[PDB]
């Protein structure tokens, strides 16, 4: 996260760290959607241009974390993966269209003050909140700058940007399965997700029922926090039918 702030304790209890066993490193962000399911970006797990193709035993999910590097004894919970499910129409060749994946945990995670699932939106939630100017919140342990690393979880609030403005900022083809967010050069305010924040959640707090909803997944960008550029997010509601199908089994 570039130009964000340290998260407060328990601020994002659905935040998950995807952790590579060997070498021991941060793989990606992710989110807790139930006691057994974790949501992430498909590119965190499968990305042939960079020879990325992780299997279940290559990683661990670390839930309830704040500090990036420390083993948070009696707070964080480390879970193993039973199975990874990548969207069958994930487009890694061109624009990361349908950049979404599910991970089933071997055992259910126990909820605590630091571990709690986020909601997934329904059609009405998405229609009411996914509006240009409406702000969401992005969290992660990724890069503080495009070109170090935070000590603790970072947070940034960013406005959803008009589809034409998103389209006009890039040469990449934008799909209906994506949305973009961030401030304009004329807005003064800054902020963006960056490398290592991938797979993390873009959340919004419904003013109707006061619950947090995951509207997006950190997907891609061209650099980090560049003027006239925006972060791109997987549109969670647009892919909910796939989510439900996988969970229903």
């Amino acid at each position: 996260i570039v130009e964000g702030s340290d998260a407060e304790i328990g601020m994002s209890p659905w935040q998950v760290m995807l952790f590579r066993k060997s070498p021991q490193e941060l793989l990606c962000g992710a989110s807790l959607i139930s006691d057994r399911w974790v949501l992430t970006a498909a590119h965190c797990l499968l990305y042939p241009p960079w020879d990325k193709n992780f299997t279940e035993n290559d990683l661990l999910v670390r839930i309830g974390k704040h500090s990036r590097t420390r083993y948070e004894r009696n707070i964080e919970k480390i879970s193993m993966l039973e199975k990874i499910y990548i969207h069958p129409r994930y487009n890694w060749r061109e624009n990361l269209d349908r950049d979404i994946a599910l991970m089933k945990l071997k055992k259910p995670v126990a909820f605590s003050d630091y571990i709690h699932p986020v909601c997934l939106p329904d059609r009405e939630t998405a229609a009411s909140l996914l509006q240009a100017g409406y702000k969401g919140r992005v969290t992660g342990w990724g890069n503080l700058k495009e070109t170090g690393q935070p000590s603790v979880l970072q947070v940034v609030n960013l406005p959803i940007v008009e589809r034409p403005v998103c389209k006009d900022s890039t040469r990449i083809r934008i799909t209906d399965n994506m949305f973009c967010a961030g401030y304009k050069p004329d807005e003064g305010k800054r902020g963006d997700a960056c490398e290592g924040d991938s797979g993390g959640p873009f959340v919004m707090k419904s003013p109707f029922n006061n619950r947090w909803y995951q509207m997006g997944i950190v997907s891609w960008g061209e650099g980090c926090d560049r003027d006239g550029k925006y972060g791109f997010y997987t549109h969670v509601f647009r892919l909910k039918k796939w989510i439900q199908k996988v969970i229903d089994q």
Partner: peptide, 27 residues
Amino acid sequence: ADCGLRPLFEKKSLEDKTERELLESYI
């Protein structure tokens, strides 16, 4: 269920430092 309600915030009726910024943007 209890999805999206934080034990240290919504469950205690405590607000985090920037959630008002999100609410103010929902015009």
